[PDB]
Design a binder for this molecule. Structure first.
Ligand SMILES: NC(=O)C1=CN([C@@H]2O[C@H](COP(=O)(O)OP(=O)(O)OC[C@H]3O[C@@H](n4cnc5c(N)ncnc54)[C@H](OP(=O)(O)O)[C@@H]3O)[C@@H](O)[C@H]2O)C=CC1
Ligand SMILES: NC(=O)C1=CN([C@@H]2O[C@H](COP(=O)(O)OP(=O)(O)OC[C@H]3O[C@@H](n4cnc5c(N)ncnc54)[C@H](OP(=O)(O)O)[C@@H]3O)[C@@H](O)[C@H]2O)C=CC1
Lengths: 299, 299
């Protein structure tokens, strides 16, 4: 089978021929159709992700493919950008009939992250939540899931032209980063903040209302002075999806809320779609702050 | 006052100084803040609109400005691209508090057109409607209004990258023109079609289910063989907003449904916003098939 391999951190991807995957007991080999790219994939190539993968390896953790006729979505540690991948049957996500490969590849990571982050921050119906990078994969998902949980969503992005999408998905208001503080004052403070920037975390805590909680989801772009936290009984939550995945209960509850809605109230925003042969281009797209939606590679 | 004048059809706009408008009994002079541009404005410059305006004149029919403190939206025959305009008090649209000038300028024409076109075609809750140019001013409005009336919306645009917005506003499915027929077959035919293209009208009637009606809203891009109509009891409706405006009952009913929702379930999509001095650039934007949303000039 053909597959892209990363032989050295910081190096280039090499499209090579490899042996067909072997399925151990409890596993199935699925024929890959689409792979959704994540910022984590980028951090992994540089050797900067929370989990340090040892080269050589096959990039891609979010796959969508076919198993004896049925199409699935699954999160694998690696081996995504290949024609075939072995997957523990118990990790397979069922999909609604018709759901496209491109739309399925933009679901797992973004929606599970959005839901778990809000659940962990105990988001209650009615609360105000600020979603940053609101026009991206994780952002566009969060907006929908937040609306599905009945929260008021204040969307933020780095460019004015990216604000229309979030506003269309349900954001009550939308603003560029420079204008967030003002919208924050008008809203009377935020109950929740999904931090994917990381550079202005302190400035973020200043937007929180009493008992507000900031979920630290990423530092894609600094300390947090424990004291500003006390005055308003604020909370900061570090967050990383991977570990959570190994918790049946959580996963179950999460899917119990997401799957029934997948394709209905929750629709993943597909962004740039690249052919298998343009994997490097797709990776670059991840870094293009002009793009919106999920970057997807189609086989 | 400063104002842009069109002295010759097909000619350029000239930014000139003119006398302050005079308010006759029943009128008010409002201080313009934003003017929304329409395709009709473009057709008028070339002398191709249903209503033939005689030069010289001031382009702009959709204004938003202030009157003794209160901000309004109003449809005037001309005089939009000027610092001030006289308007019959009875034509003034009230706006929800806070509604931005740019967002108010994208409401009147698009939403009234979308609503009246659907009402005239007797769109009933549950029916399937195909909205073309679904990522533009008239398109993005129609999608929302259709959803507000409970219809299933199949959105169509000329480019793949424009489909995300419509899908986000509520479109059940979205497709590029070339792929419409197929989606049409899967849906089992369309009950309604808002035709803004005009070039493929025949091909459009073939997408209609029994008793379906096609609303002819524009020919922005050919005859309609009366016989294909009979076999399925289809209907074709010519449509032009202007005349309708002179009908209190209609206008009243229309606003009675739109205003309460303006800013809530109905949010105008603001697109390219140009400064007063770039009026010509804004006009060009109207013709750029890359743009999405309402073209707006801000004073
Ligand atoms: N903790 C976890 O387990 C998880 C964390 N994430 C985090 O999501 C973020 C990106 O996710 P995906 O990659 O899913 O995202 P998206 O598609 O959201 O892309 C990232 C977006 O982040 C915003 N951003 C702000 N600053 C930068 C910057 N300096 N460089 C690049 N992007 C920037 C940009 O939007 P704009 O232009 O509007 O600012 C950009 O489009 C990362 O921080 C990633 O680590 C995602 C899943 C799980
Ligand atoms: N009958 C009436 O009284 C009214 C008619 N209209 C009609 O709406 C249409 C445009 O409205 P506004 O101007 O409000 O629209 P938008 O912002 O919708 O712009 C027009 C859109 O129409 C689509 N289109 C298809 N072919 C062309 C073409 N050859 N040239 C330019 N655009 C094209 C394009 O979208 P894409 O790239 O996705 O194809 C484009 O963005 C016109 O046909 C206008 O006459 C509007 C209000 C009232």
């Amino acid at each position: 089978m053909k597959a892209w391999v990363l032989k050295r951190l910081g190096g280039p991807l090499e499209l090579v021929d490899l042996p067909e995957p072997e399925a151990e007991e409890g596993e199935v080999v699925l024929r890959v159709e689409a792979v959704g790219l994540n910022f984590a994939d980028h951090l992994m190539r540089l050797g900067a992700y929370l989990t340090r993968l040892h080269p050589p390896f096959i990039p891609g953790m979010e796959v969508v493919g076919v198993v004896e006729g049925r199409r699935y979505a699954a999160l694998v540690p690696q081996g995504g950008l290949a024609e075939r991948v072995a997957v523990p049957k118990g990790a397979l996500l069922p999909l609604p009939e018709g759901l496209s490969p491109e739309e399925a590849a933009a679901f797992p990571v973004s929606f599970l992250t959005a839901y778990l982050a809000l659940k962990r921050a105990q988001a209650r119906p009615g609360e105000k939540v600020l979603v940053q990078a609101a026009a991206g994969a994780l952002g566009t998902a969060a907006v929908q899931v937040a609306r599905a949980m009945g929260l008021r969503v204040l969307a933020a992005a780095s460019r004015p032209e990216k604000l229309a999408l979030p506003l269309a998905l349900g954001a009550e208001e939308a603003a560029t980063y420079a204008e967030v503080p003002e919208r924050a004052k008008a809203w009377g403070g935020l109950d929740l903040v999904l931090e994917v920037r990381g550079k202005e975390v302190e400035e973020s805590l200043g937007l929180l209302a009493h008992g507000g909680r900031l979920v630290y989801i990423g530092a894609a772009e600094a300390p947090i002075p424990p004291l500003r936290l006390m005055r308003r009984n604020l909370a900061v939550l570090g967050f990383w999806l991977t570990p959570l995945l190994r918790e049946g209960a959580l996963v179950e509850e999460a899917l119990g809320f997401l799957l029934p809605r997948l394709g209905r109230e929750l629709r993943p925003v597909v962004g740039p779609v690249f052919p298998f042969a343009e994997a490097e281009a797709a990776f670059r797209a991840l870094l293009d702050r002009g793009h919106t939606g999920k970057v997807v590679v189609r086989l």
